[PDB]
Symmetry: C3
Subunit: 485 residues, 3 copies
């Protein structure tokens, strides 16, 4: 007749690795790595992205004829540009500080196109003949919609002096430009004056733009260039333009309210009509998990990116070395338990108030690991041009350096803490074995099989008494002494 | 008679968290995070900062007539500016590469102003009428002091050619400027020449400045602009100027000796006459702790910034077995003995086990604290309105380090608090098993962490249990008779 | 007569630290810090570096007469420059975006010089008279090899109009320049037109360079300057030039194909005809270790730089318990027994317990090593003197990761070293308990980790305890008679 102390077992094929042991098969386990994404672009904390479809920020702002998605997205959380946007700056040219404009325009609380300078304001200039084939609507010469290309009237280009005073109590992104002619004849056939200039003036702005007339290669059919510039006119300031020619003048402008920053996501996944806290270029994540293996370029309150394919914590115990050779599959109601063998019956009876302390403790470990990184911050990817490659490497080295920090720390944490969990189970069961012993030492033989050879025949009642620690060895003393000497 | 094994307890309400348990009351604790700061701007490693009051670096450098208060301080460690300096450039304009000059001048080991180009070097030119309302000394029209605004003399502005050969064995910060007019009438009225230029050339510098005459909105009453430029002249180089107008000419210059760098601190906190190794915009830290939560924009050998409000390490044993009782009566050691015999009762601590634990617990805390080995660096924010991308790259960096340090500092505390509390438990068990091995069968293992002496033990054999000098033969027969 | 439980000891003087215990001498150890290099510059993953001996990238790209080691390498993994290169721009001047060109040229998969504008293309200009004493070759005036300094012919400089269509299926790096003359007399002597220009135009380039005729300081004996500009002409694009004068015309251009990035290294070390995955300026690393203390500025897949001088993990046994005592005589194992009987005294080891430990501590060391992500390709970057703020940003990042990696590594060693020692203590105690249950009421627990056999035990009887097959009945009555 004997009683034994044991640990739970099940059908789990789940494996965890530890610092000193690999491919340990455990009963229960929880992966702290989120590997799933919805596959759709979604809203970020309630606000909808500005999905410029085959358009660029420059083409959308200046008003490329081919771009016809609604300018009326009043607020956005991030801009979604396709990589290599199809339609951008139809007339060959540039936009100064495109990348800084895009950054400002990444998250905008209020975007309202207003007309600041009417086409009626150019009485001595022609507003209808500033078109090019390169910028084409329905197979006809057209131009940028929100900017005007002014040419001569009656072989004359009288000097322009104009001003717009922002009266709107809201900042204004005003876009203007210069046309670079290809020859002196082209200069005198669109403008009339040979030497030209553009002056732009605000409180912060002093500009002098002179055309560069020289032979250039042809892009989109034209050997001339249009270089655009921008400023943010403050609530009560005036912008002053002066030109004797070569002026792509502002007609429309944009009201800007700037509160918060984001990035331009480059992706092709469709808007899924959803909301998320974390947005990847390939999908969106809904998770409290601490780490993720999806995409480096994430926007929102996102998990930390690591290179791991799996990060399996151990929420349970081993499946079938120590004094207790194996696990009892038949035990169902507890992790730690007793086995009573006597004449009345032999069965498995688990010990709660030991399993319960274990399940709460291991659960708190998992939750402490998951929640103590509530350091989740708003973060984004970035964009740098082809003459900022050195700054790009700083970004790559920072992003890669943080990756290697988390990947090493996370895996070691999993390996270190999983070992402690498995030994915490081995320590917990010995405390049950030691509690049963030290209460019946003389009456049973410590076989070391995890079992005690009960010299005294114990009924089902003293089994529960041993479980409750209420075994009186005087009550059962001599029946064991007869088997003893 | 019986002898008991147990641990110490006290009045402390200090609570610590482990990775597996929360709100665990312990006898002693240690927070490894610093929340206390001086509340004053102290000197950094012996050097007093350059506190500019309602002054910007540009206004202090160029000589804003309202900014001349801090003219003679030979060296400094960091520059203190208010968030919105009120004086700055009286005549509207700019200073090229301002934020790089600010960085260069954040830590200077020698600054001295010298007269490089006297006002007597400008005959045939006028040194007296270059004054504006925007720059005001005692309500009177004035202008920047360290630079000169030359204007025409006798309705003529002769082209001037001037050179300065630095001879001072130290580098010279030379500033100069161009005045952008507003109309052709303003130009001729100030400099008879209509088309103008400023050529500036050193060994490293080739500069051509031509004025931008155009209408602009007004600020500080003037619609014109003064764009300023600077260069560092190496100790045996010369700077060569040439202009036919619009030349804001250097009069004074500064000897620079830069042997290190810091940043500009934006703060209005008063100057306390103190010394510190770590300074924040809100105060100074002299802690040796690894982590801190005072301010992000620290400057110096500072702890690591974390988002925690508390980081409490367990240095005690009150909570977290079959010995589940903590003796509040024991007042001399962490682990100890309790003897109950017919002679009396008493508490006595195991000094060996207690001191071994104390020195080990103190090493665990000292390991975490002293292994940090922080480096010196400054965390100022020094990027302009068209440099926002670099500004975010700094933000993601210093926020990415926040998340690394906070997550690791928190778990380190949780992880090592568990080991500490189980270190205490196992140290208790070692005392129990020590006592058990001596009393093989001469006493009964009660199971509550105590032993029931079968024989009778006086106070001196109780001391034999403490000293490991218990004689099993002496009480063996007496105890054997006690059984049955 | 007695059997015992203990651990192995040797001559090892290796000292490690734990979180609670300092300077503990162990039997076996392993340092996870790499502290050695080969002292030579090696190939990076099978690709030779471009070693510009006392040459700058400008002096090699432009044809400095003394730097003109024409390319023998079609590709390179990184560029090795000296700290202060000695040749560079012989005629004083500048190269636009020099630091970004050095990033692009830092790793090149294929590089081939080609003649794009033959000197036969200039029939109305003098291609032979453009030399200077600033650029000397073999005692004679020379100039840059890969560019032509066109001057006037027959007191006439007709406006230049030239175009080069790229037809090479590869991108072309083209370099041109502008000469800044010192006076109007010099301008009319070398060129004839007094007001000049240089227009350069591709699909992505619109440029207008005008000379800066002004007095400058004398560098390399010349007060003139030559400012060079570069572009990358895409495979089916044309560059267009137009110059009134002051034109330093492209003669030779370079084919560029670019597939990776790898910084420029400043080292005086000599090439060693070797290959590595990790390179430092001091030497090259051949390590699988997680961390290193060799040089901050590495290139390749490298361990992590830290400030530590040693990161010694413990794989041994000594001086971790109350089964204390080390047996120097117990070779051939880590855990085992000491048998003392009339037949003699000897040691024996528990093979299964020892092997389970050496495999456990081996995995611990290999887990700390293998979980390292072997980084990526790496760099030490370079910024110029008006970019000191970004340098500070790069400094903060590199120094920030140091403090992160050092602290995490050091404390990881301290934490895992404690439990490695406690792993041995608990494994020894498990052998003690295994023997005690076989020796039930046949010996007495002395408490020092040794069992005094009540009966008399043979040599083979001792072996039965190790074997796990000790018959309590066979020696039952003898021990009862020895217990009085
Ligand atoms: C652990 O299991 C995986 C999956 O079968 C296997 O790839 C790996 O080799 C195993 N680890 C060891 C040490 O055998
Ligand atoms: C711990 O203590 C604080 C203060 O009483 C209490 O608000 C908090 O709920 C407690 N946390 C837990 C898990 O009991
Ligand atoms: C624009 O209008 C406001 C109205 O108060 C006026 O103060 C201002 O002078 C104008 N701003 C200019 C010319 O900068
Ligand atoms: C300045 O004076 C010294 C006197 O020896 C002279 O060598 C040096 O050339 C001068 N510097 C310049 C730029 O002329
Ligand atoms: C130290 O002990 C080992 C065997 O344990 C032996 O091989 C080695 O030679 C000894 N080292 C020295 C310096 O004596
Ligand atoms: C540990 O060993 C080193 C080298 O012998 C010694 O400098 C140091 O003082 C020792 N540490 C302590 C706490 O004794
Ligand atoms: C260059 O050559 C090809 C083939 O003749 C031609 O199609 C192309 O237009 C040329 N490009 C330029 C910019 O001249």
């Amino acid at each position: 007749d004997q009683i034994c102390i044991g640990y739970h077992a099940n059908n789990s094929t789940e494996q965890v690795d530890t610092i000193m042991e690999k491919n340990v098969t455990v009963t229960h386990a929880q992966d702290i790595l989120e590997k799933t994404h919805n596959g759709k672009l979604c809203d970020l904390n309630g606000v909808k992205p500005l999905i410029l479809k085959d358009c660029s920020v420059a083409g959308w702002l200046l008003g490329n004829p081919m771009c016809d998605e609604f300018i009326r997205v009043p607020e956005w959380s991030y801009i979604v540009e396709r990589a290599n946007p199809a339609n951008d700056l139809c007339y060959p040219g540039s936009l100064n500080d495109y990348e800084e404009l895009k950054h400002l325009l990444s998250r905008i609380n209020h975007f309202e196109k207003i007309l600041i300078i009417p086409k009626s304001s150019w009485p001595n200039h022609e507003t209808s003949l500033g078109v090019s084939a390169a910028c084409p609507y329905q197979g006809a010469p057209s131009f940028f919609r929100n900017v005007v290309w002014l040419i001569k009237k009656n072989d004359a280009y009288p000097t322009i002096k104009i001003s717009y005073n922002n009266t709107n109590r809201e900042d204004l992104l005003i876009l203007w430009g210069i046309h670079h002619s290809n020859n002196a004849e082209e200069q005198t056939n669109l403008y009339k004056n040979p030497t030209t200039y553009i002056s732009v003036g605000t409180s912060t702005l002093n500009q002098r733009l002179v055309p560069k007339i020289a032979t250039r290669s042809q892009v989109n059919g034209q050997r001339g260039r249009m270089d655009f510039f921008w400023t943010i006119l403050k609530p009560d300031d005036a912008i002053h333009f002066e030109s004797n020619g070569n002026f792509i003048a502002p007609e429309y402008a944009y009201k800007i309210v700037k509160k918060g920053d984001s990035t331009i996501m480059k992706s092709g996944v469709e808007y899924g009509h959803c909301n998320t806290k974390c947005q990847t270029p390939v999908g969106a994540i809904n998770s409290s998990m601490p780490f993720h293996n999806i995409h480096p370029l994430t926007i929102g309150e996102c998990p930390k990116y690591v290179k791991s394919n799996k990060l399996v914590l151990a929420t349970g115990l081993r499946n079938s070395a120590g004094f207790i050779e194996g696990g009892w599959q038949g035990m169902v109601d507890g992790w730690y338990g007793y086995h009573h063998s006597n004449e009345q019956g032999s069965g498995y009876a688990a010990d709660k108030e030991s399993t319960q302390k274990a399940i709460d403790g291991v659960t708190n470990k998992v939750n402490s690991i998951i929640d103590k990184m509530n350091t989740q911050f708003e973060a984004v990817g970035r964009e740098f041009n082809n003459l900022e490659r050195r700054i790009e490497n700083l970004n790559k080295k920072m992003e890669d350096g943080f990756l290697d920090v988390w990947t090493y720390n996370a895996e070691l944490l999993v390996l270190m803490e999983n070992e402690r969990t498995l030994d915490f189970h081995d320590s917990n069961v010995k405390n049950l074995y030691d509690k049963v012993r030290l209460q019946l030492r003389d009456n049973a033989k410590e076989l070391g099989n995890g079992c005690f050879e009960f010299y005294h025949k114990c009924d089902n009642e003293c089994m529960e008494s041993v479980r409750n620690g209420t075994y009186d060895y005087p009550q059962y003393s001599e029946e064991a002494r007869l088997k003893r000497e």
